[PDB]
Amino acid sequence: TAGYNKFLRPNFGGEPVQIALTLDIASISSISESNMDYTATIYLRQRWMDQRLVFEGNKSFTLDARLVEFLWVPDTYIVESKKSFLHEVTVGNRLIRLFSNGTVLYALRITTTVACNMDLSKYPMDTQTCKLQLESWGYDGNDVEFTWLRGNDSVRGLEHLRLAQYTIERYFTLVTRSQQETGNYTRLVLQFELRRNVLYFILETYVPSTFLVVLSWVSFWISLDSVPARTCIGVTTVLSMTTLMIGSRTSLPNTNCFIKAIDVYLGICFSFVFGALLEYAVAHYSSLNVDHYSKLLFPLIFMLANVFYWAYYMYF
Amino acid sequence: TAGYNKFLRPNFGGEPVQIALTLDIASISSISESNMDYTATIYLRQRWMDQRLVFEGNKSFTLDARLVEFLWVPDTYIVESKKSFLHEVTVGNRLIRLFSNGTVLYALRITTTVACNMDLSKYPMDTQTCKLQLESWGYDGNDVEFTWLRGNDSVRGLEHLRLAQYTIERYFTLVTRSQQETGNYTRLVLQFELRRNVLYFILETYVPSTFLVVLSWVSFWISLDSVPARTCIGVTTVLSMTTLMIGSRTSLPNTNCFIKAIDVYLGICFSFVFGALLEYAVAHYSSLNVDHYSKLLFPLIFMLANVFYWAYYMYF
Amino acid sequence: TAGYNKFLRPNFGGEPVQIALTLDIASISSISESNMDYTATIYLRQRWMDQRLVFEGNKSFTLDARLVEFLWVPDTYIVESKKSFLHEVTVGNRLIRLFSNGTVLYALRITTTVACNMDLSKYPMDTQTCKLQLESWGYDGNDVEFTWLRGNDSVRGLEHLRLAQYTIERYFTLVTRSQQETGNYTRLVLQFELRRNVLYFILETYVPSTFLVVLSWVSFWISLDSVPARTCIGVTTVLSMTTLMIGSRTSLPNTNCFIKAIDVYLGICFSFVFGALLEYAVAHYSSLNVDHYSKLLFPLIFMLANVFYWAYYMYF
Amino acid sequence: TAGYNKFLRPNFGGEPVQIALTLDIASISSISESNMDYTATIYLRQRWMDQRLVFEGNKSFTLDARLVEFLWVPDTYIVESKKSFLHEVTVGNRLIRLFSNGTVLYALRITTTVACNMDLSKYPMDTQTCKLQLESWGYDGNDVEFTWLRGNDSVRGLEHLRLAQYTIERYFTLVTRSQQETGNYTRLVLQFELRRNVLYFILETYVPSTFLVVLSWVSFWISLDSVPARTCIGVTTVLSMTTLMIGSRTSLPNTNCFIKAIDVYLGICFSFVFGALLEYAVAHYSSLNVDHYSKLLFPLIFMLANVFYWAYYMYF
Amino acid sequence: TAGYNKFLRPNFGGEPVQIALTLDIASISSISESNMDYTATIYLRQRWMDQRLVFEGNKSFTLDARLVEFLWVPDTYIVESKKSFLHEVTVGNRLIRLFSNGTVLYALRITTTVACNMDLSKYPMDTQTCKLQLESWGYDGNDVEFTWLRGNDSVRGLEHLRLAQYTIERYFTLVTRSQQETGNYTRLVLQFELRRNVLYFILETYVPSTFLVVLSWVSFWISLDSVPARTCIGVTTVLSMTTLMIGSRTSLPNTNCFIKAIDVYLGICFSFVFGALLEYAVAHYSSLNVDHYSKLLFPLIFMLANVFYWAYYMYF
Ligand SMILES: *[C@@H]1O[C@H](CO)[C@@H](O[C@@H]2O[C@H](CO)[C@@H](O[C@@H]3O[C@H](CO)[C@@H](O[C@H]4O[C@H](CO)[C@@H](O)[C@H](O)[C@@H]4O)[C@H](O)[C@@H]3O)[C@H](O)[C@H]2NC(C)=O)[C@H](O)[C@H]1NC(C)=O
Ligand SMILES: *[C@@H]1O[C@H](CO)[C@@H](O[C@@H]2O[C@H](CO)[C@@H](O[C@@H]3O[C@H](CO)[C@@H](O[C@H]4O[C@H](CO)[C@@H](O)[C@H](O)[C@@H]4O)[C@H](O)[C@@H]3O)[C@H](O)[C@H]2NC(C)=O)[C@H](O)[C@H]1NC(C)=O
Ligand SMILES: *[C@@H]1O[C@H](CO)[C@@H](O[C@@H]2O[C@H](CO)[C@@H](O[C@@H]3O[C@H](CO)[C@@H](O[C@H]4O[C@H](CO)[C@@H](O)[C@H](O)[C@@H]4O)[C@H](O)[C@@H]3O)[C@H](O)[C@H]2NC(C)=O)[C@H](O)[C@H]1NC(C)=O
Ligand SMILES: *[C@@H]1O[C@H](CO)[C@@H](O[C@@H]2O[C@H](CO)[C@@H](O[C@@H]3O[C@H](CO)[C@@H](O[C@H]4O[C@H](CO)[C@@H](O)[C@H](O)[C@@H]4O)[C@H](O)[C@@H]3O)[C@H](O)[C@H]2NC(C)=O)[C@H](O)[C@H]1NC(C)=O
Ligand SMILES: *[C@@H]1O[C@H](CO)[C@@H](O[C@@H]2O[C@H](CO)[C@@H](O[C@@H]3O[C@H](CO)[C@@H](O[C@H]4O[C@H](CO)[C@@H](O)[C@H](O)[C@@H]4O)[C@H](O)[C@@H]3O)[C@H](O)[C@H]2NC(C)=O)[C@H](O)[C@H]1NC(C)=O
Ligand SMILES: *[C@@H]1O[C@H](CO)[C@@H](O)[C@H](O)[C@H]1NC(C)=O
Ligand SMILES: *[C@@H]1O[C@H](CO)[C@@H](O)[C@H](O)[C@H]1NC(C)=O
Ligand SMILES: *[C@@H]1O[C@H](CO)[C@@H](O)[C@H](O)[C@H]1NC(C)=O
Ligand SMILES: *[C@@H]1O[C@H](CO)[C@@H](O)[C@H](O)[C@H]1NC(C)=O
Ligand SMILES: *[C@@H]1O[C@H](CO)[C@@H](O)[C@H](O)[C@H]1NC(C)=O
């Protein structure tokens, strides 16, 4: 039998081993944009056929995890894993199940940290297509062929997963063929699109900015004769805009090097406030008309620009 | 005897193994709302019957932990564990106790990090029903049946536990039947309701906000003739409200994406201050009556709104 | 001999093993009030008698640490340890010493993190009685009896330890009997009282608050005729008190949920400043006497209140 | 055969083992300037010839990773590694491939943290030449000779790598000879120049500073007759410059002890603002001409100084 | 031969083993004053004579690291290590070299974290004499005698090490005799004096404070007639001094409980500014002479006090 053949894959020499995969994401622990990765716990299930491990019977038997050290198991590995570990809570979280016809069920609880590149250009409404790829580290396509057990039904838990900030709406599984120097491999890629919620940032960041712009508009009505009111409203507007900029800049650490969307909108609001103050100063200098015309020109142009920005960042 | 049968569960083929469970939470190390989990140390005790491990005698014997590697132990596992480890202080923290009739006592010190979903909508008075679920990773309900030794007496230490911010008032144990693709499992769920203290946030955050609103009310009495006093009181009110908002927003990191309760109350206070300032400005503009009427209208309506908010967030 | 009896404790069946303990705290690495624990390195020494490990001779012999895997060692464990590890610098930091009459010396370097509950009510002058408890995880009092080798002598290094913020003044060792569900255990508890230094917080936090209150007192002498000086002194007082409050609140993270002592004193100072400003405003309103009477009333009452607070928080 | 000769290197005594190396940087996880290191995942491939491991055949065979414990593998090590670990996702990420003529392919997934010294003098445009050096820890040049399989081809993935803040433009591999006390070693050094992006810091930090200097220039046009406008513009300029300095100083922790470039430019801008304010004060004192001459002198000299600084920090 | 004698030290019974030590600090990774320790990577080399490991020959042979598990190696350990680990990059970073006459070379790459007590009284110019002590954990002076191979030449890399903030100027090695309860041990202590750079803190913290004091001096020239200029200069001075105090207090976390030197100097500057403001207020009150006399008295006394402070904190 397979005494010292545990190093030899089933059908050592000839047809490769067809391993069917099943994934069950118990929970996506975190999604770090600063480190550009995601930590998630998965229930990796693999099913192959070992002709040397067959027996006479009708039913299957669940064996201890310590038997894994005596049998052959596929060298499955996450392609873009930075740090992963099999859970050892009480014993090794390994399920091994031997079947009559040779089927071997191998289940593991793996907490993995996969790095998916994130483009934060449309940061408030960005959709990140993050992938979890499983491949054989040592055995190429001529030795191990990885396959999905039930297509897109193989992966479970992603449909009902609701993260803190993101939400999976479209996930699917593919059987790609990776071409490396050592050889050709069959890679199983489960890719899912994480879309951040849109309402939170609007009601918590965009609404205060709109209120600041409204206060800047109101600042036009107050004239220079009432210097206390003008000074107070200007101080409040400037201080609130500075605090809003600070709060927006402190949400995400200085790690990204792209042009964001919330930053552009806040810069537009700050530029509008600065231009309003500069126009008030210029009107005062010229007087010692324009303000009345601005009181009607600013709302229409500002609303049109806001609609243009929204149409640009939602549709095209 | 069970020479190589340590991989075989007791009564391998036929009736399952009835394992009685006992829990003893020594300490809940932390409760992280940002990561939405809790780290706690538990004294997991399991009792089953091994017919192959029986002997002739009357008394029980405590064996070394290293004997665990030679016997069969259940593959108990925490369902929602992110990171757990058996303590190795001097030796492996394992108690194995063999009995005359076949009873096996298996005790472990496990520091586990279980993720329980937290809803922070009523954040100052939120009650989180966090669960600790134990299940067999490999053996289904037809092989291992998990049971509580003494019902709700089995779990000890939760009644006398007093955390820093929370307090357990109602905890109970259930025997649920989890239906997975591999098979049906008997899960033991100890769920406990953690209720945060109510007085600390009221006396440290709500009271300063009430004092700020009182100062805003007092600002009405001071007229425009004394510009220094009005300027000082307005500056103090605005600066204090901004600092209070900053302190409230820095307590919890930017991880939750829900509408909180302390945020709503602080926003109401900020809106009241802003409306008071705007009404003062409008009254000054109209004069160059309303303030006297407001001095009587504001207290009653404000108190009624506060009572309505309290009744909404305490009862229904 | 004890071929496979390494799993069997000495005198397996009958009188228990009397293990004498010796502790040597090399350094208390940290004392975290936010996590409510302390990390310290200890030189754990255990001495028992193994009748099966006796030989003919007169002298003792130091054996390699790898021999520990072949002998029986007590399952000593820290009762409230959150994370501990035996040091592996070059080899395993284990001293095993075999003696002629059967004495076995077992020394380990253990960096442990013990959680001791901290009451921060009198935070500037709090004394925390933190304990380090050693117990047998598996063997009860009928199998292993833990004893202190030399009573309060046994523990060394605590008398000469001077931490950054604390100072041990009274430490002692007790032999308690813990009653658990599994059985009764002999626990060795070394408890030490850590007292924080009193002068640092007085000279760095209380003195600036006293200077702020003195400046608030001086603010009474300046009249309303010199509006620049009054405005400057008021701005300086308010800004300094806000900065002092911020610095006091940022020293300890938002983890405790108790009423502190430094917070109470700073709140008293802030209330005094606010009351001084309010009284100045009320006197100005009434004039358009009281201030002169206050200039004499405030010092005596303030000093008496400070003495009462000091007597309350030092003696009773 | 090589029964106990796994401790003996191939050709034990005589000609050394020629090991050909291949590197494949899957991802550079992080580049920490505060800790002055970089964490990256590499696919280390080694090819040597074991005369004792030859067999009769024509094709190669991929063996299990557990066979590595039975064969001889080179003691390759990263020279400046602070913390590294071979990935264990499902099994040990080891590829072992035995060939007919004796070639042995050994592939490992290693996440390493190499410390490369960073000179942050020209911090916005600094180019760091960070190295990854592989050497034999035990076997000197007379026992193991490390060689690159394909010269600069050998390393793959660096050309297409685009980090968050840096960009590799020139990387190359060298075979150096390290002279140590124990012996002479053949070190394989892959050194790559990481150049930080230039546009982000200009458009996000330098542009606000330029706008602040422009506002300071505009402050000259406003005269002392309009004290509200002058006070507002001065307050805005000072507050904005302080906030910009704070934001620049909070980007990098207080770890470097060098004279940076962004700090010098921001200090120049702050000195310009302070000198403008001082000159305005001096002109007011002298009046109770210079400002008109300054309105023309400042732009030319400021632009020339900026061009000189740019030429200094880009070319020489 | 030494079949089971690997637990027995060479010359088991009689003369002790003379182990010659060699140190090579590859890099001091960090020096944490908050935790009062330093993390550094060392190349620990030990040379002893094993009479049972001799063979017939003329040359030495480098054996695999896995042979270490079969031989006897000294139980060297860092006396004040909080956390250390032998590097496992590809294999165990162990060099074992057997010689003809019995010499055994044992080299290890150890990243260690040694706690050296730090006195931050003269914090800007503090010199910390931090030690790295190596001792035998189990074998006393009658079993293992640790010796330096070449005295001060034994340690390499410290002379050319230039850290971020510190600089080693005087390091030396000593053979001390530690007296413990178990026995007397030969400890090898390499102690080095780390001196922080003096110019960085002067040009980045002391220079802004001096500029603030200069601005406070200039504030005397401006009279009360120009209230805008006086208000602006006072606001700038107070705000800049507060920001400088905040920046100085945020450099080091609230962990030390000593009287620093930079804190004393900044407090002196703050007291000077406060006294200048108080003297201006008192002069204004008395007028409604002193300022002219102060304009000459302040520079000389301030310079003399600064020189006295410098002489105190540099020489005696
Ligand atoms: C023992 O037998 C071995 C196999 O039976 C022999 O190894 C092979 O040796 C040949 C040549 O000696 C190698 O061919 C080269 O392989 C290179 C790497 O694949 C090729 O480079 C091309 O491909 C890589 C990968 O995509 C590109 O990155 C690169 O830019 C280029 O396009 C060469 O072009 C060439 O084909 C062959 O790869 C080796 N096989 C393996 C598995 O390494 C070995 O030489 C024999 N030894 C003796 C002494 O006879
Ligand atoms: C060797 O013997 C094995 C067992 O004796 C055989 O394995 C079984 O094979 C059958 C069909 O070949 C499997 O039946 C299917 O199982 C699917 C998964 O359970 C079912 O899917 C349904 O259930 C899942 C889980 O709830 C849902 O997620 C899914 O949406 C769907 O509702 C199918 O509907 C179908 O029943 C059976 O499960 C296999 N058993 C195991 C333990 O995997 C094996 O085929 C035999 N091999 C040979 C060569 O004869
Ligand atoms: C095989 O032999 C075993 C021992 O020889 C048997 O185990 C014992 O079984 C008896 C009853 O079947 C147990 O008695 C109960 O134990 C409970 C737990 O101790 C008690 O509860 C009380 O004490 C706990 C602990 O303090 C409290 O928390 C609780 O609130 C309550 O006050 C019960 O009151 C009762 O005494 C005994 O404990 C078992 N021993 C052990 C070591 O578990 C076993 O049943 C035998 N099996 C067969 C098939 O005969
Ligand atoms: C058993 O055999 C061993 C080897 O066969 C012997 O070890 C050698 O012993 C000799 C002298 O006893 C050593 O020579 C010295 O080595 C020093 C270290 O290399 C040299 O120092 C110089 O080089 C170092 C390293 O560059 C510099 O840092 C230093 O400043 C100086 O420039 C000495 O100058 C001198 O050569 C030799 O190194 C040993 N070999 C090894 C591998 O250690 C051993 O003595 C024999 N024992 C007996 C009992 O006979
Ligand atoms: C078996 O043989 C063993 C050794 O052959 C015996 O162990 C020794 O037992 C004697 C007394 O029974 C111990 O003497 C005491 O040791 C104390 C600890 O050293 C001393 O305390 C003094 O020294 C310590 C350490 O510096 C100080 O901290 C303390 O304050 C005090 O000054 C005592 O004063 C006294 O000497 C001896 O130490 C033991 N040896 C060891 C290695 O532990 C053992 O008893 C024998 N058993 C039987 C049954 O005969
Ligand atoms: C899964 O669904 C995707 C669409 O989201 C589709 O492209 C793919 O073919 C599906 N895979 C299978 C085979 O079910
Ligand atoms: C434990 O308590 C819960 C809640 O009261 C109850 O539903 C359950 O039946 C109890 N279990 C036992 C066995 O007492
Ligand atoms: C240790 O000290 C405590 C406190 O003084 C005392 O109660 C106890 O009895 C002492 N133990 C011995 C054995 O000296
Ligand atoms: C690798 O590239 C460097 C830089 O061009 C060159 O100096 C070196 O010789 C190259 N090595 C080989 C073997 O091509
Ligand atoms: C090492 O140098 C120190 C002085 O730096 C000296 O005290 C010591 O004796 C020297 N050791 C030897 C043996 O060279």
Please write down the HEC assignment for all residues of C42-103: EEEEEEEECHHHCCCCCCCEEECHHHHHHCCCCCEEECCECCCEECECCCECEEEEECCCCE
Angle at D299 between CA D294 and CA D303, to 5 degrees: 145
Portion 262-291 of D in contact with E at CB < 8 A: 277, 281, 284-285, 288
**E197: nearest CB among D77, D139, D257:** D257
Instruction: Please report where in the chains the tokens 């199940």 appear, as a residue.
Output: A97
Paired tokens of C72: 């029986």
For chain C, how far is it from start to end, CA to CA, in angstroms?
64
Span(s) in chain D for CATH 2.70.170.10: 5-195
Span(s) in chain C for CATH 1.20.58.390: 199-314
Residue D260 · residue D118 · CB < 8 Å: no
Q: State which amino acid sits at residue C285.
A: Y
Q: Does A229 touch chain B (CB under 8 A)?
A: yes
CB contacts of A164 in chain B (<8 Å) are 36, 255-257
Angle at E243 between CA E237 and CA E245, to 5 degrees: 100
> Is the C-beta atom of A174 inside 6 A of ligand 6?
no
Paired tokens of D85: 């670990």
> Is the C-beta atom of D180 inside 6 A of ligand 4?
no
Could you tell which of A142, A143, A178, A181 is best to mutate to test the pocket of ligand 1, judged by most ligand atoms within 8 Å of the CB?
Answer: A181
Q: Does C93 touch chain E (CB under 8 A)?
A: yes
Rg (CA), chain A: 30
What is residue D97's three-state secondary structure?
Answer: strand
Q: Does C257 touch chain B (CB under 8 A)?
A: yes
Q: Is C303 exposed, middle or buried (0-12, 13-18, 19+ CB in 10 A)?
A: exposed
Compute the distance from residue C209 Cα to the ligand 4 centre, in Å: 67
Give the β-pairing of A61-63 and A184-195: unpaired
Instruction: Please report where in the chains the tokens 């909508």 appear, as a residue.
Output: B121
Angle at A259 between CA A253 and CA A265, to 5 degrees: 95
Residue A114 · residue D29 · CB < 8 Å: no
How far is D44 from D135, CA to CA, in rounded Å?
Answer: 12
Compute the distance from residue C11 Cα to the ligand 5 centre, in Å: 23
C100 CB-near residues (< 8 Å, 6+ apart): C54, C55, C56, C57, C58, C59, C60
Other beta carbons less than 10 A from residue A35's beta carbon: 18
Q: Does A101 touch chain D (CB under 8 A)?
A: no
Name the region of E13 (left: φ>0; alpha: ψ -120 to 50; beta: rest). left
φ/ψ of D258, rounded to 5, equals: -125, 165
How far is D309 from B25, CA to CA, in rounded Å?
Answer: 65
How far is D238 from E234, CA to CA, in rounded Å?
Answer: 13
State the DSSP H helix or E strand holding residue A207, giving kind and residue range, or none if neither. Answer: helix A207-219
How far is D213 from D270, CA to CA, in rounded Å?
Answer: 9
Instruction: Please report where in the chains the tokens 């039930």 appear, as a residue.
Output: A150
Instruction: Please report where in the chains the tokens 């390759």 appear, as a residue.
Output: D76
Rg (CA), chain E: 30
Nearest CA in chain E to D183: E62
Q: State which amino acid sits at residue A193.
A: E
Give the β-pairing of A17-32 and A144-148: parallel
Residue B253 · residue B309 · CB < 8 Å: no
Buried b (16+ CB within 10 A) or exposed e, E96-117: bbbbeeebbbbbbbbbbbbbbe
φ/ψ of B60, rounded to 5, equals: -95, 160
> Is the C-beta atom of E153 inside 6 A of ligand 10?
no
The residue among D23, D25, D46, D62 with the most chain A CBs within 10 A of its CB, best to mutate, is: D62
Paired tokens of E246: 């905040």
How far is B94 from B44, CA to CA, in rounded Å?
Answer: 10
Residue among A132, A111, A149 nearest A192 (CA)? A132
Instruction: Please report where in the chains the tokens 């001095």 appear, as a residue.
Output: B295
Q: Does A258 touch chain B (CB under 8 A)?
A: no
Residue among C70, C114, C110, C76 nearest C94 (CA)? C110
Residue among D27, E88, C211, E229 nearest A117 (CA)? D27
E53 CB-near residues (< 8 Å, 6+ apart): E2, E71, E98, E102, E104
CB contacts of B249 in chain A (<8 Å) are 247
Instruction: Please report where in the chains the tokens 């990191």 appear, as a residue.
Output: B253
Q: State which amino acid sits at residue B112.
A: T
Give the β-pairing of E85-86 and E144-148: unpaired
Resolution in angstrom units: 3.1
CB contacts of E165 in chain D (<8 Å) are 257
Rg (CA), chain C: 30
How far is C13 from E121, CA to CA, in rounded Å?
Answer: 61
Paired tokens of C100: 């002629």
What is residue B128's three-state secondary structure?
Answer: strand
Q: Does E229 touch chain D (CB under 8 A)?
A: yes
Residue C108 · residue B91 · CB < 8 Å: no
Binary contact (A137, D109; C-beta < 8 A): yes
How far is C127 from C120, CA to CA, in rounded Å?
Answer: 9
State the DSSP H helix or E strand holding residue C204, giving kind and residue range, or none if neither. Answer: none
Could you tell which of C98, C99, C100 is best to mutate to test the pocket of ligand 5, judged by most ligand atoms within 8 Å of the CB?
Answer: C99
DSSP for chain E, please give it: --SSGGGSPSSSSSSPEEEEEEEEEEEEEEEETTTTEEEEEEEEEEEEE-GGG--S-SS-EEEPGGGGGGS----EEETTBSS-EE-BSSSB-EEEEE-TTSEEEEEEEEEEEE------TTGGG-EEEEEEEEEESS--TTTEEEEESSGGGSEESSTT---SS--EEEEEEEEEEEE-SS-EEEEEEEEEEEE--SHHHIIIIIHHHHHHHHHHHHHTTS-TT-HHHHHHHHHHHHHHHHHHHHHHHHHS-TT--S--SHHHHHHHHHHHHHHHHHHHHHHHHHH--HHHHHHHHHHHHHHHHHHHHHHHHHT-
Residue among D249, D316, D257 nearest D117 (CA)? D257
How far is E266 from E250, CA to CA, in rounded Å?
Answer: 14
How far is B80 from A27, CA to CA, in rounded Å?
Answer: 8
Give the CB-side neighbour count of residue B12, counting CA atoms within 13 A. Answer: 14
CATH hierarchy code of domain E199-314: 1.20.58.390
How far is B80 from B133, CA to CA, in rounded Å?
Answer: 7
* Residues linked to residue D128 through DSSP beta bridges, in sequence order: D194
Residue A146 · residue A173 · CB < 8 Å: no
> What is each CA distance from B273 to A213, A229, B217, B270, C200, in whole angstroms?
18, 15, 9, 5, 40
How far is B241 from B247, CA to CA, in rounded Å?
Answer: 10
State the DSSP H helix or E strand holding residue C289, giving kind and residue range, or none if neither. Answer: none
Residue D288 · residue D223 · CB < 8 Å: no
- Strands annotated E in C138-228: 144-148, 155-156, 168-179, 184-195
Give me the CATH topology for the region D5-195. Acetylcholine Binding Protein; Chain: A, (2.70.170)
State the DSSP H helix or E strand holding residue B189, giving kind and residue range, or none if neither. Answer: strand B184-195
